[PDB]
Every structure is written in C-alpha cells, then in structure tokens.
Amino acid sequence: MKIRDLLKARRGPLFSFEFFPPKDPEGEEALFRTLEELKAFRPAFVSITYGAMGSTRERSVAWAQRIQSLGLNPLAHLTVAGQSRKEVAEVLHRFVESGVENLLALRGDPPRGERVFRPHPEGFRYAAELVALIRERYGDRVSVGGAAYPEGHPESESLEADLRHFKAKVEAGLDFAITQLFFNNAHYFGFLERARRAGIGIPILPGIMPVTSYRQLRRFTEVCGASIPGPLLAKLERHQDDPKAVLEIGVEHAVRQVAELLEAGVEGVHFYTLNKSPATRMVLERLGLRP
Amino acid sequence: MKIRDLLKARRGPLFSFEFFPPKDPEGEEALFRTLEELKAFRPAFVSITYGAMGSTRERSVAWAQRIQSLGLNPLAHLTVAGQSRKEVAEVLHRFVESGVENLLALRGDPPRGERVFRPHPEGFRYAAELVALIRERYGDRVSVGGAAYPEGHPESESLEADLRHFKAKVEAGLDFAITQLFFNNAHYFGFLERARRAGIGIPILPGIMPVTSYRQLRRFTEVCGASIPGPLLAKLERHQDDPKAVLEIGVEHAVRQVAELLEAGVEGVHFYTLNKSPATRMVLERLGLRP
Ligand SMILES: Cc1cc2nc3c(=O)[nH]c(=O)nc-3n(C[C@H](O)[C@H](O)[C@H](O)COP(=O)(O)OP(=O)(O)OC[C@H]3O[C@@H](n4cnc5c(N)ncnc54)[C@H](O)[C@@H]3O)c2cc1C
Ligand SMILES: Cc1cc2nc3c(=O)[nH]c(=O)nc-3n(C[C@H](O)[C@H](O)[C@H](O)COP(=O)(O)OP(=O)(O)OC[C@H]3O[C@@H](n4cnc5c(N)ncnc54)[C@H](O)[C@@H]3O)c2cc1C
Ligand SMILES: [Cl-]
C-alpha cells in the first residue's frame, strides 16, 4: 500500500516503526521479537534502514521481505553514497521486484572521520537525484520519501540554504517526508511553518525517539546535529546509571511530546525504535493507542 | 533613547548587553571594568537584571542610575515575583524618576526546586499585568519590552498556549520582545514565523549567550528550558576543564550564530554577558566591529 494513498485516505494518523538490519544472529532474534511485540499496534508502514556504502545491501532487502511476510508494509531506505548509478538502480530494482512500494531516498553520511561529502566516481551527489531517478524509471508506481531536518543539516552553510534545498528535493518528486529526531516540539512546529511558507505542501511526519540511554542520546545528537533540552539532559544525567529509570524518563518525554503532536493534527509519527520494543510499546499504550 | 525610537531610527543592528547587579565591592569594580570595555562598542542600550524577589532592588536602582550616568542607555528589568502590586509600583516609579526610559516587564521564577509559580498574596501573576500597569500610569513616556521563549516557557502546557499568552502579553502594551537564549538559529527563525503567523508584528530580538562555562551552561538551560546542540555539547564536554578552550568554543559558535542572524536582517542582538567582557568582545570583533 502506497504511503501517498495511506496519507490521503487517513481515518486517523499513521504510526510507523523504524528498524535497522541486524548484524548478527542475536540481533536478528532481538528484531524478530520486536516486530511481534509491535505488529499489534497496526502500523501504516515499517522502515528498514540502509547501510551507507551499500555494505548491508542483501540484508535490507531480506528484512524488507521479512516484514512483508508479517503482513506489514515496508519502507525501504536507499542511499546514494559510495555506489555507482547502476548499483543504486540495481538495488532499487531489487526492492520493487520484491514487491516493495515505498522508498525513502537518502544520500547517506560520509564515513567515520571524513568531514566532507565526496561521491562515488560514477555515483550521485544529492538525494534529489535518486528521487528524480525513481520518478523517471517508476513514475507513480512507487511512493518516494525523503529526510527533513527541523534544526537544519549539520553540513549546510545556512538555514535559508538548507530549506531551499529541501524544496528542490520535494520538487524532484517527494510524496512525504520524515523528520530527523527532535525533543522539543517547537523545533518541528518551527520547521513546519517555515516550510509551508516556502510553499512546500507534502505531508511532513515528525520522527520521534524515546530515550533509552544517556550515552547513546549524546552520541546520536553529536552526529546528526539535533539538540537535547537542558531539563531532559539533566534529568537523564542524574539517573544515567539506572536503565529502568532512564526508560521511564524517555517515555514520559515522548508521551508528552507525541500527545501535543497529535493534538496539533500531525499526519502521523515515525518511531525510532533502535530495534527495541519496551519504549515505543509503553509510549503508544499510555497514549491510548490500545492493542 | 527609548528603544521604540531607537528601533525606528536604527543605522545598523542594535547591539546590547545584559548585566546583573553584583553583591560585593569585588564584583562591582569588575562590572565597571566590563562597562569600561564594552561601551566602546557603542551599544544602543544596556540592561540590568532584577531581583532576589525584590530583595535586591536597591542594587538594581543603584545600577540603573549608574549606567545612566555613564551615558549608556538603561533597560531596567522589573519582576512581579514576591512583591505586592504597590511595592511593584513604587520601584517602577523609582526607575522612572531616575530618568530610565526603558523597562523589561518580567514575572520572575519560583524558588529553585519548586515547579509551580506562586505569586505574592497581594501581587501580580503574569508579566502582562506589569505591562498593563506601566502603560496605565506612564502611557508611551516609557518603552516596554517583555520576554519571548523560542523553545517555549517550561511551565507552559502546550506551545500553542505559550504563543497565545505571549501575544496577549504583546497586546498589553509591548514595543519589543527579547528572546531567552538559544544555541541553534532554527529555534529563533521558527519562532519568528510562528509569531507573524499569529499576527505579532513587533520587533523580536534574539538573545545570545556565548558559552564560557560548561557547568554554568548545563545549570541555566535546565532552569530556562533551552536545548544544547549535540555537536556543541560534546565539544564543550571534551574540553570542560580548560576554561580558555571553552571560551574559544563558545565564541566560534556565537559568531557563526550572530553572523547568520545579521545576514537575515534581525533588528539587533542582545548579549548575555554575566558581567564579563571577553566573550562578547571577541564575537563582535571577529564579526568585524572596532573598539
Ligand atoms: C528519516 C531518516 C532516515 C534515514 N535513513 C538513513 C539510512 O537508512 N542510511 C543512512 O546512511 N542514512 C540515513 N539517514 C541519514 C542521512 O543519510 C544523512 O543525514 C545524510 O547526511 C543526509 O541525507 P539527505 O538525504 O537528507 O541528503 P541530501 O538531501 O542530499 O542533502 C545533502 C546536503 O547537501 C545539501 N543539498 C541538497 N541539494 C543541494 C544542491 N543541489 N546543491 C548544494 N547542496 C545541496 C543539503 O542541504 C545537505 O546539507 C536518514 C535520515 C533521516 C532523517
Ligand atoms: C530576556 C529575558 C530577560 C530576563 N530577565 C530576568 C531578570 O532580570 N530577573 C529574573 O529573575 N528573571 C529574568 N528572566 C527570567 C524570567 O523571569 C523567567 O523566565 C520567568 O519565569 C518568565 O516570566 P515571563 O516574564 O517571561 O512571562 P510570564 O507572562 O510571566 O509567563 C509565565 C507563564 O505563564 C504563562 N502565561 C502568561 N499569561 C498567562 C495567562 N494570561 N493565563 C495563563 N497562563 C499565562 C506563560 O506561558 C508562562 O508559562 C528573563 C528572561 C528573559 C527571556
Ligand atoms: Cl576582572
């Protein structure tokens, strides 16, 4: 089921989960359990993450298929970094032909260290280019999506620039967008108004991550340039050594974030689960989104 | 000399500094040193903080007359916390008979560690009430600013309510607003849009604090509810013990910030100094201003 159509016909908002393809049998088993626990909430879509450089190629496809057989609806991430144009098309073809209908077109970061983006000698440079390619080969047979950044991409010269670019990418052929994570809703509302004023009208879904680790939260935000509210930061720091206390703080945080997000009429919420179920499960249950 | 008038007639952006009244001789001659250093930057106004719960009002009156007399242009802070209305009026009147033409009508906070605000038995409850009072007794003989919160006042139950209440605070009689500190310009641009969309057309000035102390940053943001970008936080974290590295970090960040703000044409920037001069000096100079 195309997400363009899922969004149009919405009786209500769409809740989606994000997962990454496990590196080892353990993780594979942790994911199987996670999907079981979560498929109960009846998500509109389910994302399968993609290793930049295309290292995890056959995993991402396998799991795209693993979710299909659970009767859920997959969203295939696809990046352009470290890959030829053929190589990017080949795996797109591999998705479509696995029956996948929904694609997040992403560029991907540069590797560890390495501060600037240099493409493959025959690869793409921007996500807008993969979106363009998708529409050119598949038109509307697939629903394409992209990344938005409420607090701006950490590489961008300005916020002016970051948004003009977001717009170019939408004009390339996006049907929706999902945001990078954010912990205070002003950041989303902020961006949404600024986008709509730029005459960008596609559905823009907030991405939410329920905090489960002080160390991870710090390390994640350092990479993607998101900011942690000072009260949350201190709360977490005071309790960082007690994993079940942290889980409760991250949940209470998400619950109250998501509750206003719903009250404000967002089209849906995309959940960064990190392949675990307790946090997202608890958030949804407290919101009354009843199994 | 009224900020309302200075804003209409502004040659370039209005730079301004915030100060608090010191507790002992040591911090007083420290503030005169800082006033001596920063005043060559020809600021449009200089603001002095208030107030223990009025407990330190003699000090703010003393400094408001002291900055007037240096031929700098005073913006006198006034809270309603822990005082009856009559009391709040008397002090207001001591400012205005001093020659002060500019007032920042504020509420003040509860004691550290209490969540709910509890007014004085015979006191005001909202900054707005102070605005109204000032306008009742002094019409437009003075100019009145109030605070704006780009990431929302912590006490506010929704971001739609915080704005709704800010606008009411504007319609009470505001000429300008100054924002609480932010470390990513998205917070501010986002807020500006939302406010115009709500039809608040007054000048809203970004308030910037160049980070000089890691623990200090961590304590203030916990209280005030602002967020710290991931990259900055890990940067500071790395170098927290070397004060002059941290100073270097806070400066390159605030420069990056103020530069873009100026290039987008804000009417001015308001600088949280902590009564120290180097950080703000360094930002203005790197920005190409001459002492
Ligand atoms: C929901 C979501 C899912 C993600 N999934 C993955 C994943 O599965 N695998 C993975 O590796 N990463 C993933 N990422 C991370 C993403 O790959 C990185 O943030 C990457 O750095 C940017 O991706 P992008 O598609 O937004 O890049 P782009 O949209 O191409 O932007 C790249 C940079 O160039 C700028 N730009 C755009 N167009 C132009 C132009 N024409 N001229 C000059 N500059 C331009 C943009 O401002 C930006 O700074 C995800 C991110 C999000 C938000
Ligand atoms: C630029 C700036 C300068 C500052 N200077 C000082 C200072 O000198 N001394 C000091 O102690 N503190 C100072 N502060 C801190 C400030 O006092 C605290 O943040 C205070 O808690 C906020 O009060 P306020 O004046 O902004 O607004 P308030 O109007 O007093 O807001 C308080 C709460 O009530 C809500 N509210 C407003 N009106 C209504 C209503 N009609 N009905 C229901 N709810 C309502 C608001 O959303 C908010 O959550 C300053 C803050 C800023 C941003
Ligand atoms: Cl000194």
Author numbering:
A (entry chain B), B (entry chain A): 1 to 291
The authors write:
The FAD-replete MTHFR in crystals was a homodimer of two holo-subunits. The FAD-replete MTHFR has one FAD cofactor per subunit, forming a dimer of holo-subunits. FAD treatment after purification not only contributed to the holo-subunit formation, but also dramatically altered the subunit contacts in the dimer. The large conformational change resulted from an ≈50° rotation of the apo-subunit relative to the holo-subunit upon FAD-binding. In the holo-dimer structure, a β-sheet was newly formed at the intermolecular interface, which was designated as β7'. A non-crystallographic two-fold axis is found between the β7' strands. In the FAD-replete MTHFR that was determined from crystals grown at pH 8.0, distances of Glu18(Oε)- His270(Nε), His270(Nδ)- Ser16(Oγ), and O4(ribityl chain of FAD)- Asp109 (Oε) were estimated as 2.98–3.06 Å, 2.95–3.30 Å and 2.58–2.71 Å, respectively. In our Thermus MTHFR structure, the Asp residue was 2.58–2.71 Å apart from the O4 of FAD in the ligand-free homodimer at pH 8.0, thus it was located in similar position of that of the NADH binding form of E. coli MTHFR. While the catalytic efficiency for the folate-dependent reaction of the homodimer is decreased to ∼50%, we observed that all flavin cofactors bound to the enzyme could be reduced by CH3-H4folate by the anaerobic titration. Since the lowered activities of Thermus MTHFR were exclusively found in the folate-dependent reactions, the positioning of Asp109 could be responsible.
Methylenetetrahydrofolate reductase (MTHFR) is one of the key enzymes for production of methionine, which is not only an important amino acid precursor for protein synthesis, but also the precursor of S-adenosylmethionine (AdoMet), which serves as a major methyl donor and a substrate for polyamine synthesis. MTHFR uses NAD(P)H to reduce FAD; subsequently the reduced FAD reduces methylenetetrahydrofolate (CH2-H4folate). Here, we report biochemical properties and unique crystal structures of MTHFR from T. thermophilus HB8, one of the model organisms in structural biology. We demonstrate that the Thermus MTHFR is a dimer, rather than a tetramer, so that its symmetry is perhaps more directly relevant to the dimeric mammalian MTHFR.
